């Protein structure tokens, strides 16, 4: 509306894009996933752009085999000022697009499952700009549905003190009508979650499994990176000797960049003087690798594994 209105609102571009997008996706779920679609195919620089009846009538398979053949250095590669800020952007707007969508949409059983299908389509393809853009998008996404995971959690604790407030309160009684709503709320809440829990699943299987040992080293580190903020984020879920595994056996991987994102990971983890316990497993499977590499090759490789052994050391 006036100046006064906007400025006092500082809606982004993005937040801006993707509230317009929430209410085209109300109108018309399909124009709307076609235009996430055409997006996620735009921003691998593909030249081509899907179409309703390709939407409608075409597996996500066949809608990737014939955007690959209108390829022409794609968005995330590129140098130049006009393309500095694009990997921060592409990376926020997946977190602006499901922060907006956590209460509602997220849990519709369409618009996750078009968006998962269709980037771990594009992990699978032989075209880097694919393989690269994709693999960002579904490790920026589970971080967006694990924050959806912690907002949950946090009402399924008000949910659980809540009804216990009650439960307590009757005892001998007939089970009233807040103690019903609460009890559904409660499976609600629950059935919320194990829903993230799936989509977090389809992303680590179909993706990041696939991803973390991809031949482009780049790939590589954008998972280890991120499943470093997993495990910190979500230590229950995430943070298990089958997870840190990945982690433990790309200690061994060959380029500096790389092996500098497992130590970055493995430094966040131990700082935190209370899932240290949890590392115990680890630290006795894989010190010998860690303890090798504080005379790395690579000095600022080493310079991290030096102090993750100091940090171990401390505990």
């Known amino acids: 509306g006036t100046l006064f209105e906007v400025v006092k609102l500082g809606k982004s571009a993005m937040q801006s894009v993707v509230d317009d997008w929430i209410e085209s996706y109300k109108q018309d779920r399909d124009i709307a996933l076609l235009?996430?679609?055409?997006?996620?195919?735009?921003?691998?620089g593909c030249r081509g752009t899907v179409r309703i009846e390709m939407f409608r009538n075409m597996q996500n398979?066949?809608?990737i085999r014939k955007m690959t053949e209108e390829f022409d250095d794609y968005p995330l590669t590129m140098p130049g000022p006009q393309w500095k800020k694009f990997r921060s952007n592409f990376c926020e707007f997946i977190g602006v697009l499901i922060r907006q969508c956590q209460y509602s949409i997220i849990y519709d059983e369409y618009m996750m499952d078009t968006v998962i299908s269709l980037l771990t389509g594009l992990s699978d393809s032989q075209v880097r700009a694919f393989r690269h853009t994709s693999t960002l998008a579904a490790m920026k996404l589970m971080t967006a549905?694990?924050?959806?995971?912690?907002?949950?959690?946090?009402?399924?604790?008000?949910?659980?003190?809540?009804?216990?407030?009650?439960?307590?309160?009757?005892?001998?009684?007939?089970?009233?009508?807040?103690?019903?709503?609460?009890?559904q709320k409660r499976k609600e809440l629950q059935e919320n979650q194990d829903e993230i829990e799936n989509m977090m699943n389809?992303?680590?299987?179909?993706?990041?499994?696939?991803?973390?040992?991809?031949?482009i080293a780049e790939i590589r580190a954008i998972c280890i990176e991120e499943i470093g903020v997993w495990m910190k984020m979500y230590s229950d879920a995430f943070l298990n000797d089958s997870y840190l595994k990945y982690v433990g056996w790309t200690l061994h991987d060959r380029?500096?960049?790389?092996?500098?994102?497992?130590?970055?990971?493995?430094?966040?983890?131990?700082?935190?003087?209370?899932?240290?316990?949890?590392?115990?497993?680890?630290?006795?499977?894989?010190?010998?690798?860690?303890?090798?590499?504080?005379?790395d090759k690579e000095y600022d490789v080493a310079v991290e594994a030096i102090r993750l052994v100091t940090l171990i050391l401390h505990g």
Request: hydrophobic fraction near 40%.
């Open 35 to 44: 235009d996430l679609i055409n997006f996620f195919i735009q921003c691998s």
């Open 61 to 63: 398979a066949e809608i």
């Open 145 to 183: 549905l694990v924050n959806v995971a912690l907002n949950l959690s946090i009402h399924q604790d008000n949910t659980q003190r809540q009804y216990e407030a009650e439960r307590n309160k009757m005892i001998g009684k007939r089970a009233n009508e807040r103690l019903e709503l609460l009890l």
């Open 202 to 215: 389809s992303i680590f299987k179909g993706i990041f499994v696939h991803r973390y040992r991809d031949a």
């Open 255 to 295: 380029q500096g960049e790389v092996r500098l994102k497992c130590l970055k990971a493995l430094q966040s983890l131990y700082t935190n003087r209370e899932l240290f316990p949890k590392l115990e497993l680890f630290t006795n499977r894989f010190k010998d690798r860690i303890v090798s590499m504080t005379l």
